[PDB]
Design a protein around this ligand. Structure first.
Ligand SMILES: O=P(O)(O)O[C@H]1[C@H](OP(=O)(O)O)[C@@H](OP(=O)(O)O)[C@H](OP(=O)(O)O)[C@@H](OP(=O)(O)O)[C@H]1OP(=O)(O)O
Length: 279
């Protein structure tokens, strides 16, 4: 497919800054791809969305207005005003992140896309359309645990979600989507967050919360209880540890996770505790 895809329709000038030495955008068999080039030769590809070469509203509110351009592709209009080069840089980072997701087989859990900048005064965000389904907790637990373990794999690599769980006291469940087979997360039109070398108080705290983000989401949905089956407040023992272990996260110290887990102060996915216990 590699060589077949690069024989398709070149859409690069509509998304990335021309010319780009590493990434191109191609259409091939009703599929838009992001192709990665090395030696000036194509090496790998990632699928972005399906193509069909007043729209219906899919949503509107805090996160912005999303339309239905086609039945396989959503369109999120931009609210801010920025230069073209601002959305091009975001696209390049999304593509890099998109490859990471592929290499680790977790791409299905995260809805990414690309900002279309061919009209600088009409910039919208294309992404796959997904059919949401009211998420349950009693029966969807395996799917939710599979997403949390995927998000942990993301957090361990330095990436975290910009609007899902900024800290133990903030959660945006609306950005958790359940489908027939799995749980996904949306509101990633800006890509994932990552450290940039800044050391101010806000950026250092954010980097700690970013590595334990997966833990906050899980404990918000499945918090621990006592013998009376009353909700144990997991936030307090976690924050207490943070204030006494500056610039250190719980994921980076697996010995403390299992300790808080056996002590009944935090909840962990089923597979994580077993993989930490045996290994
Ligand atoms: O004529 P183009 O410059 O190549 O633009 C097309 C066009 O979108 P617009 O003309 O509205 O900008 C297609 O829509 P149709 O005319 O076929 O209805 C759309 O294909 P979709 O049907 O899926 O919307 C396609 O977008 P894509 O092929 O990436 O999915 C997009 O090309 P661009 O991606 O460059 O905007």
């Amino acid at each position: 497919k590699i060589n077949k895809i690069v024989n398709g329709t070149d859409l690069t000038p509509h998304y990335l800054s021309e010319p780009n030495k590493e990434f191109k955008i191609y259409r091939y068999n009703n599929e838009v791809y992001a192709v990665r080039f090395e030696n000036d030769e194509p090496m790998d590809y990632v699928l972005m969305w399906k193509s069909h070469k007043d729209y219906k509203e899919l949503g509107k509110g805090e996160q912005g207005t999303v339309y239905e351009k086609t039945e396989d592709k959503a369109m999120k209009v931009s609210r801010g005003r920025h230069p073209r080069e601002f959305y091009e840089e975001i696209n390049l980072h999304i593509i890099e992140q998109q490859f990471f997701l592929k290499y680790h087989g977790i791409q299905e859990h995260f809805v990414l896309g690309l900002w279309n900048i061919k009209n600088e005064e009409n910039v919208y965000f294309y992404m796959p359309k997904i059919n949401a389904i009211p998420i349950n907790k009693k029966i969807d637990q395996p799917k939710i645990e599979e997403f949390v373990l995927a998000l942990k794999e993301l957090n361990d690599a330095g990436y975290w979600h910009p609007d899902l769980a900024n800290n133990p006291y903030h959660i945006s469940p609306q950005n958790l989507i359940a489908t027939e087979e799995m749980v996904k997360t949306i509101d990633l039109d800006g890509g994932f967050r990552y450290d940039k070398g800044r050391v101010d108080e806000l950026s250092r705290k954010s980097l700690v919360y970013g590595k334990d983000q997966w833990l906050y989401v899980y404990n918000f949905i499945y918090p621990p209880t006592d013998e009376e089956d009353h909700r144990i407040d997991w936030r307090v023992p976690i924050e207490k540890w943070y204030e006494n272990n500056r610039d250190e996260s719980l994921s980076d110290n697996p010995h403390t996770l299992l300790r808080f887990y056996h002590e009944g102060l935090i909840s962990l996915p089923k597979k994580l505790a077993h993989d930490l216990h045996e290994t």
